[PDB]
Amino acid sequence: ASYVVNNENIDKDGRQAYTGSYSLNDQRTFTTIDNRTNQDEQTTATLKYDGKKAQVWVADQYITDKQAQNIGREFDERIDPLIENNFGEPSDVDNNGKVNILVYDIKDNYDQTGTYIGGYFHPRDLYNVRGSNHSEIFYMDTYPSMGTDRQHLNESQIYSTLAHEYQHMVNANENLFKEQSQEEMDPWLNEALSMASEQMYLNAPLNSRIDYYNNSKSIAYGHSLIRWDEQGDTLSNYSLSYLFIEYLKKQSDNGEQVFKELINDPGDTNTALQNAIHEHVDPNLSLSKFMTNFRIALVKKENSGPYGFKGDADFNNVHPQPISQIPETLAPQGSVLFQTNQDFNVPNDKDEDISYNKVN
């Protein structure tokens, strides 16, 4: 027998719950971040593309003009329409109608660890504060994101990351500047939506995120969907966020159109999700139960109903790893798949937020 065990608390900051007893070539200097030390530093870049919606600034001398033009055209022709039609629009704090794409070798510890940063967006750039470039800008890595041969960097490897970062930018605009609350979306769902935009751009599933899900020990032993593990196994959060937003896409009667509704909802993140579920999934289904159903769907993948992804083949290789010993506690929206071949009774002293759901 197997059971999906979930902490149904939707407060990401909630407590541990007990599971029970048993001109071209112009120059500009930008602030960048040395991610080995988190110190600000200065990077001078050259303008290599000046298009309708994007300016491509280059500060890696191995990148050619044609490569920079390819990046700019991809943004103007494909990324910007995708994001504006399905997610939102950027701020324009510098009043120029465009966004900056700074293409350079993001500084990190890849040489020592093999882990690298591909790109990022920093909301401080939208304000008059220390380190700000006072512009819509996102930062795109060259080496090793485009490959490990600096003589043959493949710029098209970064294109889906363009969508990822632009989603962060327009999400920030809506929630920080266009809404009274000026409160960011909860990071787990902001990242989810960035990864949804990557899948839309690629017209293909993010198989590396699924592979990571399938091999993650932290996920198998209860990693939280909503508590973002900044200091620990952050890749597990990326994988859970991605699968959740794809689950919502498949469960929603308006599919990908739900993404912009989540961003533009004036409520907090859980309110936005609850509204989407009530309007597009089931008017009597709570967010907490929808999230439990998500965990069940990863296991069963039923070709119809709440316990799957509507048979979408993009998700057929997802395989939750069962465990034999349930952790003593689970974080909010942390879940495990428990299997036993002996008789099993749900503990009567489990915390009320812990739900046991028999699979098979």
Ligand SMILES: C[As](C)(=O)[O-]
């Ligand atoms: C790829 As990122 C650092 O914008 O989540």
Ligand SMILES: [Ca+2]
């Ligand atoms: Ca601008």
Ligand SMILES: [Ca+2]
């Ligand atoms: Ca780099």
Ligand SMILES: [Ca+2]
């Ligand atoms: Ca909002």
Ligand SMILES: [Zn+2]
């Ligand atoms: Zn992101």
